[PDB]
Chain length 115, copies 3
């Protein structure tokens, strides 16, 4: 399970860490789930373009996060848009939020299985 | 939709932008439609290897482009290959082009 | 086919090359087949978090590698965990290995078809 922010906007490490921490709090809160083993990341891609433009843009991708459905997906997308427009000064119209569920298509192993 | 160029070859930002612009143009021209919602990117990955070698290499992944069919995909791969060998001096054999098929919200709904 | 090490652990280029080559050897060894077409990468993502912590963490994602299956994927994940905890000193519990097979999903072309 991953929440990745892929963006051409540059922000310092402490603020990035705070931004992801806020998003993780939002997923937990809106979804009503503990997310004890979520991965997240701020992937700075300076050359990223959207619609032919290298202007500020944030793509957020949520993969295999259990518990997203009609009653909450938009609510989660709204809150992540707010956080980013707040912290990053990106236009909301240059935020795009995608949810995908790959849980059943992949095999996953923790290193803790092997000693 | 996404066209990502993942490569261990470094070029300046403005040349990367030009290069992605030309790839977007080729996608639009060869698929015969606008690329209004396309994301594209030049992801410099200095340690990228292919076939056991860290020599110059470009992997292009196109995800969820509409119109993708047996009759246009090869010309589009060809055109992308020419653009990269031109702009990056990558050997053709060290270019690999993948087409992949894949709930979304624009932040405009909320702002 | 791709094996990507996505990690907040910082290592020099030579050590990244050596580590990826060892992972390639493990895949080829376990599969009993050549890894000639494989891409591998060390993707330094300094802001990467796992379980609310930016502490040393490695996520290895293997995509569309033919011949990896239920009978050997645990064996390969065990070997990769050992290689990374050796080279990167990451805790095995902050190693996570994911296998996805998309091998029949999408079209692919070598640029050698068109130039060379």
């Amino acid at each position: 399970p991953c929440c990745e922010l892929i963006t051409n906007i540059s922000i310092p490490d402490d603020k990035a860490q705070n931004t992801l921490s806020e998003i993780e709090d939002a997923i937990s809160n809106i979804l009503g789930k503990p997310v004890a083993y979520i991965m997240s990341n701020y992937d700075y891609q300076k050359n990223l373009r959207f619609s032919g433009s290298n202007e500020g843009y944030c793509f957020v991708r949520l993969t295999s996060i259990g518990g997203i459905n009609r009653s909450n997906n938009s609510l989660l997308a709204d809150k992540i848009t707010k956080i980013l427009s707040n912290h990053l000064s990106v236009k909301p119209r240059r935020v795009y939020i995608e949810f995908r569920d790959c849980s059943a298509q992949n095999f996953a192993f923790s290193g803790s299985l092997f000693g």
